[PDB]
Design a binder for this molecule. Structure first.
Ligand SMILES: Brc1ccc(CN2CCCC2)cc1
Ligand SMILES: Brc1ccc2cc[nH]c2c1
Lengths: 452, 167
């Protein structure tokens, strides 16, 4: 057993106890390291830079979630304090330098490296935090550390700077004829592909900084969760566009064609593993103005009814089937973000920030690990892109969709419902007839590609 | 087979509406919650002597997916319409939620309760009499709950089951 300095000269030398650190009964599966349940910030910083072993999962978890219990400015100070190890008050001293000082000092530099590499937003948002980090990194001397100091400096400067896919499908609208682009004129395969690309990019731009601390639900959500909000708004927008397409097609035969085409787009979203796209369609079909359109549903081909019913069933029983299906597939995919949002919020709200042991407050770290596990799952689906070519005009059409126009939510929502009542009145009012609005053929080109 | 009641929690986001269900499900002396399992949204209870199962849907965090409300609401037999006693906008939003439930269920009489939640130690802006008058205009019960103490939580849910049984 080694001789570490006094707690009066070095706070991280204080021994472990029930009053400053507690563990879970299990160990890290692949590493054999104990799982920290809670501890004081001093003890969490000690274990973040432990001398006996490296702890990458704890470092990653810590750096993703520490802001709920410690400020960036306070963490930097704590790690600068950790690095400045005093010699205790020879054989004993030479062992202390090789078994405690060199390992700990290398561990703080590794934390510095991970911080700047994966969580640079703390430095972007506080230029003094970066000034202090460079001051610290500039004071670090040693041949062992020159390698790690140089690599950090390279990351800071980099951060301060800032086979064949298938053939694009065309139906009635021809390339460049953006004025005619619509639900029934664009090829259903290409709608689904171009929407999958938009929705994949939106999904991939959401960072853990927008999710940790449930900040997308708070007063400053527009500042802190902009990419997430753009993603949800695209989704909401597409659902409303589908509902609008349906209820604004007053002629029954044409409305059946519209619904049937949306089911084809859904079928292609299923092929592409775009679960956000799938649920955009299911949400439109389950909306009040669409769900009540029984005369339209009855006229839908039996194969398309079953396609829709199975998609609808993915949401039943708290997304039981959706969850099973997401686990079974491999990337690329576009998950539905909402489940993660509810899980992160409930983890944060349903667990205390602190645990108390013998009257002493311990930061509840397990709560944070649980949140970092959810953000890690989000990230595992953000690495792989799709092998699909972008069509800049179709992409721009879907980016600029605005079914609501200048109307507010309620006004538009009521207009959709009143259109529903008009086109298919409540029983016993008989079904009226309405004139056709489309001057092009309603027949679909199908969901199988046109060329090999 | 015992009766299963499919309950839906609705209300404004950002005002701790999730505490209602979390406090119900988690044992009165347990604070370790995992929302990623079945037992987190299902609870076997005895109400007025009759044992039953409560399946509770709370989509807290998904408020911006506004076009998914109808889908989520149609899953329910009974609704808890939640507002925060310190957020007047969340109270004023209730009328919209109720009207949407009525449209989704296609009924003027849907089993429903109004829940005023005390989510923190910030100042109350909605007096109990305001909420009691609103609940009376809708013809439904009003229950106040405390997020810190668990007071009123069981009463809110049990009252809703009674509203379904007496429908
Ligand atoms: Br278009 C359309 C119209 C109606 C519905 C909902 N129905 C409820 C029972 C069968 C489907 C979906 C799509
Ligand atoms: Br969307 C939808 C909702 C319910 C059912 C039942 C059969 N097909 C469905 C589609």
């Amino acid at each position: 057993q080694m001789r570490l300095p006094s707690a009066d000269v070095y706070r991280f030398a204080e021994p472990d106890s029930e009053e400053n650190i507690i563990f879970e009964e299990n160990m890290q599966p692949k590493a054999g390291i104990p799982i920290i349940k809670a501890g004081t910030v001093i003890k969490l910083i000690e274990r973040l830079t432990y001398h006996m072993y490296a702890d990458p999962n704890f470092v990653r978890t810590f750096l993703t979630t520490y802001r709920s219990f410690c400020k960036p400015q306070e963490l930097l100070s704590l790690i600068i304090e950790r690095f400045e190890i005093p010699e205790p008050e020879s054989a004993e001293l030479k062992r202390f330098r090789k078994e405690y000082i060199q390992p700990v000092q290398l561990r703080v530099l590794n934390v510095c490296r991970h911080w700047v590499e994966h969580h640079f937003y703390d430095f972007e948002r506080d230029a003094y935090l970066l000034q202090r980090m460079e001051e610290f990194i500039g004071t670090v001397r040693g041949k062992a550390m020159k390698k790690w100091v140089e690599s950090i400096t390279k990351i800071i400067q980099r951060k301060k700077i800032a086979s064949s896919p298938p053939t694009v499908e065309w139906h009635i609208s021809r390339p460049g004829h953006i004025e005619t682009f619509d639900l029934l004129t664009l090829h259903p395969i290409e709608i689904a592909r171009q929407l999958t690309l938009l929705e994949s990019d939106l999904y991939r731009a959401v960072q853990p900084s927008e999710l940790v601390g449930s900040v997308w639900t708070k007063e400053d959500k527009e500042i802190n969760s902009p990419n997430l909000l753009k993603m949800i708004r695209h989704t909401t927008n597409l659902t409303l566009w589908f509902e609008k397409c349906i209820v604004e097609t007053e002629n029954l035969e044409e409305r059946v064609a519209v619904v049937s085409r949306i089911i084809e787009i859904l079928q292609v979203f299923q092929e592409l593993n775009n679960f956000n796209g799938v649920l955009e369609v299911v949400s439109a079909m389950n909306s009040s103005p669409v769900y009540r359109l029984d005369h339209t549903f009855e006229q839908i081909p039996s194969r398309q009814k079953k396609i829709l019913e199975e998609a609808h069933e993915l949401s039943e029983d708290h997304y039981k089937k959706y969850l099973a299906k997401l686990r079974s597939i491999n990337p690329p995919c576009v998950p539905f973000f909402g489940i993660y949002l509810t899980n992160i919020l409930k983890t944060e709200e349903g667990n205390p920030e602190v645990l108390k042991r013998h009257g002493k407050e311990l930061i509840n770290f397990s709560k944070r690990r649980k949140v970092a596990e959810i953000t890690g799952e989000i990230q595992q689906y953000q690495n792989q892109p799709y092998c699909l070519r972008v069509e800049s005009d179709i992409k721009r059409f879907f980016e600029n969709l605005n079914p609501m126009g200048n109307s507010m939510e309620k006004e538009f929502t009521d207009y959709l419902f009143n259109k529903s009542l008009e086109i298919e009145p409540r029983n016993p009012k008989p079904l009226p007839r309405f004139p056709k609005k489309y001057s092009y053929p309603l027949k679909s080109p199908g969901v199988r590609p046109s060329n090999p | 087979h015992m009766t299963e009641y499919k309950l839906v929690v609705v209300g404004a986001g950002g005002v701790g509406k999730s505490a209602l269900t979390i406090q119900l499900i988690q044992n009165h002396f347990v604070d370790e919650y995992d929302p990623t399992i079945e037992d987190s949204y299902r609870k076997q209870v005895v109400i007025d002597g009759e044992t039953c199962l409560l399946d509770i849907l709370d989509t807290a965090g998904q408020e911006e997916y506004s076009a998914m409300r109808d889908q989520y609401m149609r899953t329910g037999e009974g609704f808890l319409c939640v507002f925060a006693i310190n957020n007047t906008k969340s109270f004023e939003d209730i009328h919209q939620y109720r009207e949407q439930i009525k449209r989704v269920k296609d009924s003027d009489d849907v089993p429903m309760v109004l829940v005023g939640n005390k989510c923190d130690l910030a100042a109350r802006t909605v007096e109990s009499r305001q909420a009691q008058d609103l609940a009376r205009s809708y013809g439904i019960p009003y229950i106040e709950t405390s997020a810190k103490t668990r007071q009123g939580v069981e009463d809110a849910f049990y009252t809703l089951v009674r509203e379904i049984r007496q429908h």
